[PDB]
Amino acid sequence: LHAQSKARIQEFVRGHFYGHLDFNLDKTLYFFIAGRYEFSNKGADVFLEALARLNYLLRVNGSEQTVVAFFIMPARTNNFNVETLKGQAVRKQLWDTANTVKEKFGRKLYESLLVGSLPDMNKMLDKEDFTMMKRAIFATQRQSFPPV
Amino acid sequence: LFEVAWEVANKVGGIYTVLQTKAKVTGDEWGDNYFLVGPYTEQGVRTQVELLEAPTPALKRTLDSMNSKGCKVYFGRWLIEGGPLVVLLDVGASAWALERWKGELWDTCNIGVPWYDREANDAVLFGFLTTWFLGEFLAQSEEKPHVVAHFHEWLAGVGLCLCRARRLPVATIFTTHATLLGRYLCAGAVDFYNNLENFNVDKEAGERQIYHRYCMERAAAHCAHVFTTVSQITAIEAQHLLKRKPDIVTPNGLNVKKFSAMHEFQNLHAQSKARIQEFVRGHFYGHLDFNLDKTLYFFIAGRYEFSNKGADVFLEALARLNYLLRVNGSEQTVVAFFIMPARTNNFNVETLKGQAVRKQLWDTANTVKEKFGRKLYESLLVGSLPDMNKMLDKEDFTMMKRAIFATQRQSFPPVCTHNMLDDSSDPILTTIRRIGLFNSSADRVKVIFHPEFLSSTSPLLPVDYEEFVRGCHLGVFPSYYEPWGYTPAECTVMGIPSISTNLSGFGCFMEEHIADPSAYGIYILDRRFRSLDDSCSQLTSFLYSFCQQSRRQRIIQRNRTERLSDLLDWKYLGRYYMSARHMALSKAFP
Amino acid sequence: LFEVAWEVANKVGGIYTVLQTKAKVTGDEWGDNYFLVGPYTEQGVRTQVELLEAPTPALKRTLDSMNSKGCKVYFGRWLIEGGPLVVLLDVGASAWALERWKGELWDTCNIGVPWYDREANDAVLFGFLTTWFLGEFLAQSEEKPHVVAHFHEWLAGVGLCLCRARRLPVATIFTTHATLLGRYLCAGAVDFYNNLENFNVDKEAGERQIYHRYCMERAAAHCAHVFTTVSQITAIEAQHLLKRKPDIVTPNGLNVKKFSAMHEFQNLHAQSKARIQEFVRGHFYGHLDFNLDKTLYFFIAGRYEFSNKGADVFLEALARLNYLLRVNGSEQTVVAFFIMPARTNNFNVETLKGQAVRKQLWDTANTVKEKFGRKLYESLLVGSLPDMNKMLDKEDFTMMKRAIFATQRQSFPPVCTHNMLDDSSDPILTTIRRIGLFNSSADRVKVIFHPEFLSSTSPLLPVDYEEFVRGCHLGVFPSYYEPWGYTPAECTVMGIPSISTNLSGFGCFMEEHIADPSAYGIYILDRRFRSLDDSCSQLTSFLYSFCQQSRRQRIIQRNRTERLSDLLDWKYLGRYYMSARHMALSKAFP
Numbered sequence A: 001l002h003a004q005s006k007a008r009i010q011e012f013v014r015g016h017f018y019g020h021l022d023f024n025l026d027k028t029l030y031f032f033i034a035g036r037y038e039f040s041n042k043g044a045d046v047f048l049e050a051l052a053r054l055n056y057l058l059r060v061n062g063s064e065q066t067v068v069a070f071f072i073m074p075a076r077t078n079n080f081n082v083e084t085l086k087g088q089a090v091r092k093q094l095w096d097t098a099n100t101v102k103e104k105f106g107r108k109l110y111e112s113l114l115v116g117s118l119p120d121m122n123k124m125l126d127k128e129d130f131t132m133m134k135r136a137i138f139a140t141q142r143q144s145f146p147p148v
Numbered sequence B, C: 001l002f003e004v005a006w007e008v009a010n011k012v013g014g015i016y017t018v019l020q021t022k023a024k025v026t027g028d029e030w031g032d033n034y035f036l037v038g039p040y041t042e043q044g045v046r047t048q049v050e051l052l053e054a055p056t057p058a059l060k061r062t063l064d065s066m067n068s069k070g071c072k073v074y075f076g077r078w079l080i081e082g083g084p085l086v087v088l089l090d091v092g093a094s095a096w097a098l099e100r101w102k103g104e105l106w107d108t109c110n111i112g113v114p115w116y117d118r119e120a121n122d123a124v125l126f127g128f129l130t131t132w133f134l135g136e137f138l139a140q141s142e143e144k145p146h147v148v149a150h151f152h153e154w155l156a157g158v159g160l161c162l163c164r165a166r167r168l169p170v171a172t173i174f175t176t177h178a179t180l181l182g183r184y185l186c187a188g189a190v191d192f193y194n195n196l197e198n199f200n201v202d203k204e205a206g207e208r209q210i211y212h213r214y215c216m217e218r219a220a221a222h223c224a225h226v227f228t229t230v231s232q233i234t235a236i237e238a239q240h241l242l243k244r245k246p247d248i249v250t251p252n253g254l255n256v257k258k259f260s261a262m263h264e265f266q267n268l269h270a271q272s273k274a275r276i277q278e279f280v281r282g283h284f285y286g287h288l289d290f291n292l293d294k295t296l297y298f299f300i301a302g303r304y305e306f307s308n309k310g311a312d313v314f315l316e317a318l319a320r321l322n323y324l325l326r327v328n329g330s331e332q333t334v335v336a337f338f339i340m341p342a343r344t345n346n347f348n349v350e351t352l353k354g355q356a357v358r359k360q361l362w363d364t365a366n367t368v369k370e371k372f373g374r375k376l377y378e379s380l381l382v383g384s385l386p387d388m389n390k391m392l393d394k395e396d397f398t399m400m401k402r403a404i405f406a407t408q409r410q411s412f413p414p415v416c417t418h419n420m421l422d423d424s425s426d427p428i429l430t431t432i433r434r435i436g437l438f439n440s441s442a443d444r445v446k447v448i449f450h451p452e453f454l455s456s457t458s459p460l461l462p463v464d465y466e467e468f469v470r471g472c473h474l475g476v477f478p479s480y481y482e483p484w485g486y487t488p489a490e491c492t493v494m495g496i497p498s499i500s501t502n503l504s505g506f507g508c509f510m511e512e513h514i515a516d517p518s519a520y521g522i523y524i525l526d527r528r529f530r531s532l533d534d535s536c537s538q539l540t541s542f543l544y545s546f547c548q549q550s551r552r553q554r555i556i557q558r559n560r561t562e563r564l565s566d567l568l569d570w571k572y573l574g575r576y577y578m579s580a581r582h583m584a585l586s587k588a589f590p
């Protein structure tokens, strides 16, 4: 139950970090604090400066481990964040592009296996899927920082 | 109007669907006066007719008289389209007066029936019950209206002459579908169509024990006010056999299922053809060395009749086409399906093995493509491009290599998708072996024999007959002795080209209504005035001509052939029935 | 033949694709004699033209003379269809003799150019280089052949009169696309088409600082042997403005991408429309109270021009249609898309929320259907039927109930799929608010504004412009000041009905070639002889008429409109160019 649920978190964080996924996600730690929105009585502040000290320490040891901290603190809010939903939509669009390309590759591989040969990757290029993948990568580019 | 037929409760022939489709237009024409007469069957009252215990609103006394006099009859609604008013007459209700009836039948039309033929006795008693019902009705109808009687089948028509023996003021119409003795003529190894001027009818009916059946058939034909026949060639054979020229021909019509879009019948052909390809790939694992985008699908369907359906002529025509295609250096390859239901046991192990191998290859492709999708997703997320240096993985190549190793085969693909019970006496396989079609790589014609009705419950070929017909490219029906022909009409309605002969009823009907029947895709032959070699050579020429067109030309041909569905619809064929009924009414009473 | 245009290296206008498509037919006509003249651009030599350092096989001395005399020129092949033989002339290679050239330009056509307009100076030097190249060529060609010069754009045409000033024996053709001053007329809040007989051209060119541009445009038009114009109305406005009646009209042609099947353009409409539905569902979560099978999709595309594209008239016509649909008690609902690229920032949070809600509903349906599939698989394996007493599970109903609870919404759906930078000065939103279209449940017209070019990289609407156009049902283009019109032509090629006006070039061209342009789906208006109210009422009547037809009638309309693609192809439009060239040759030298 921890194995699959963690995956559901990754699909979220990828969506929240489109255009900045420069760290290996297999070496990522997930910390969290939950409960009612109480500042001093729940230790949010101490957790925050402890994480700040950990960040300062991790930039001098030259380590690749990166941690993600969730704050499930129910507060009074209105609407959603446009950037977060945009990131989710971009992740889904990338998934759709990958699905289309993999379906084309599956068709070509099925034909080549039926005729009794091997894929030499000289025809999967197609000079057309590279265009759509290139413009997808162009769309993924971002300049501003991800939201908190 | 009264429709008399033996196929109202049982589906033994195609008359059932013909009557079911004609009921709508006949009811629309005749209002509430349309009544139909048929036998009562225990198996045809459960989900076949809604019995109406209430008396007919316009008829109360005759049913009471009939019930009180001993015979049992039922009224109701046929479970078909439109509003039918059907009557069912029991065959055992009046089985206690067969002796008296045949005693008083000697002086009427002078017909005798063997005692050991239950069906003939049932037909005779049905005719007696029908004529008794007409007599009672006209006695109780105050002679105010005029009654017209229509008879569709010869067993049901035996009572027609009985009415003519009772001086009943009714219009008598006799309609036949085929000659019973003619069916047995074609199995006598004697030419039939080229000797139509000389038949020793009496004896050939005599020693073949079909004498009396033809006897009352001809009696009904002669006594009828008007005589109708399904098609032109059937009319000619009736004139030269029954010695009575039919007044008018009555081709059978079929209801057409229209679509919202004209081109939808093309789309149904697009996907259904795909379902065929997945089959043929499975049947040709390890030998797929030809481009499948340049493949033609021919087929012949119907009951397993060798000479009467033209299987042999199609076979040698395809052999000639194969011989011709190996000297022109063409890449086109054709696949011919034989949907000939025969007696078989179990399946063919090689065919199922091929299906399983195709599915295994699909599974391997799915796994590899899922791995590629994962890798491509990761690379796109990080913001790069697949350079194909990591998709190799040094592991998937191993599984793909052993899959290709498994796909290798040495023996030839089989010609049958089943297991024949007998092989030393099956005409199809003997002819295939004789002409030399073994589905070899160097060949250009493939043969697939599937002796079973196509159904969605079958493990292989998970399509019914309609979808398979819609998926093919050209149906070849070189019929020899075919009264009307339903399968070519069905193919024409579906929107595909067909090959027929003037001998068949459909071919003769089409040849006399549309000029130049070659541009519309209904390739007509001539098996009446030409020898077998000429016919097979013409069929081979037609097959090569079909192979010659491009995809656009084939689309044009199918689109044009689609528009001919309106010709075969009942909306156009009802005119002949109207004319026959009007002529009968004029002959009976002005 | 020589083609002179400024849009050979830069794609600033639609002349690029016109020339690219015309190159094939022009080369096929002229063999290897087809040369094209264009400016040299640093950005248009990388992947835009294959430079040929080798001398022209039929021309060696002129290039050497040109290179030795100081100016730099290049030969090569344009990276377009067919075989093009293009020459690129640098704009800075001969930038050291502008003073001398304009000193000797005073006596030729008497044109003066401001010193602060770099584009005009570049055009003037391009004309000087072109006329110098022609002079060198004819001096070195031994005067054996005859040279014909064709000019497509006014900046490139300034040198044409220069040739006429040098007594060069060539045929002079001047082709224009639109009047520059006419564009600024339409923004002057003064009626333009009803006052075509009286223009104070000199002053209106004077105080608007477009005096000299019109000056050499008119000089080139007058000096040319033949004058051509894109369309009939453009020809009329040129005659009433440039005081020279064009000899013949030259409509622009477009290459058509044919398919294997005629009906394939229908199938591309079938699936693409589906991609629209998945969008609109997402934009109408919690308010889907109308049957989507009876929904019509209208759209207007092109550059963001308010009056010149007829957005306002379309808006009040749709408002009138909405008012009419609420009194007839009809269930038909129409959705109107406005692909009007404007300046925007970010997306709309509600739209993305709706897309996410639709995807979540899809996920819930997928989970429930997978559970149902598992249960049905088990029941079919055991040999039973689903009685629906166990699919309830008392658990999936909870998740479905909370999903339905989440879907509930109270506020109205938004009208824009983006976030406008400004809202107090945007004409579209102000008009929408004024006419009262808020996508309410009781309404019958929905408005969707998408101020961004459609692309496959967009998160919402993952389709490009072509697929979205193919998916709609009727494109409304009530153009007011449109010289030729490319979008309605593209829609007609795609195979969809369109609404245009005689004011537009496409509408005028269609109105004078096909009689009764209503049965083919090209609904023409009359904005020239009618007031605004009459035009909007006629548009509303046309919209209601389109809403009145059934699905079969719409299929007929689209099928018939598809066949008109051959009219707009270059294979038919090349005849006018041939006639113009022949007339020019006859005028120059018999």
Ligand SMILES: O=P(O)(O)OC[C@@H]1O[C@@H](O)[C@H](O)[C@H](O)[C@H]1O
Binding pocket: A002, A003, A004
């Ligand atoms: O707990 P982690 O360090 O994230 O390990 C990741 C996953 O943990 C558990 O779910 C299982 O051991 C999995 O086999 C492992 O892949």
Ligand SMILES: O=P(O)(O)OC[C@@H]1O[C@@H](O)[C@H](O)[C@H](O)[C@H]1O
Binding pocket: B266, B267, B269, B270, B271, B550, B551, B554, B555, C260, C261, C264
């Ligand atoms: O009929 P064919 O020659 O097999 O053509 C193949 C298919 O035919 C029809 O279904 C359509 O035109 C398809 O677009 C086409 O792909």
Ligand SMILES: O=P(O)(O)OC[C@@H]1O[C@@H](O)[C@H](O)[C@H](O)[C@H]1O
Binding pocket: B260, B261, B264, C266, C267, C269, C270, C271, C550, C551, C554, C555
């Ligand atoms: O064009 P419409 O009125 O939306 O019809 C809907 C679709 O149109 C075409 O794509 C085809 O005819 C489809 O068979 C039909 O389902």
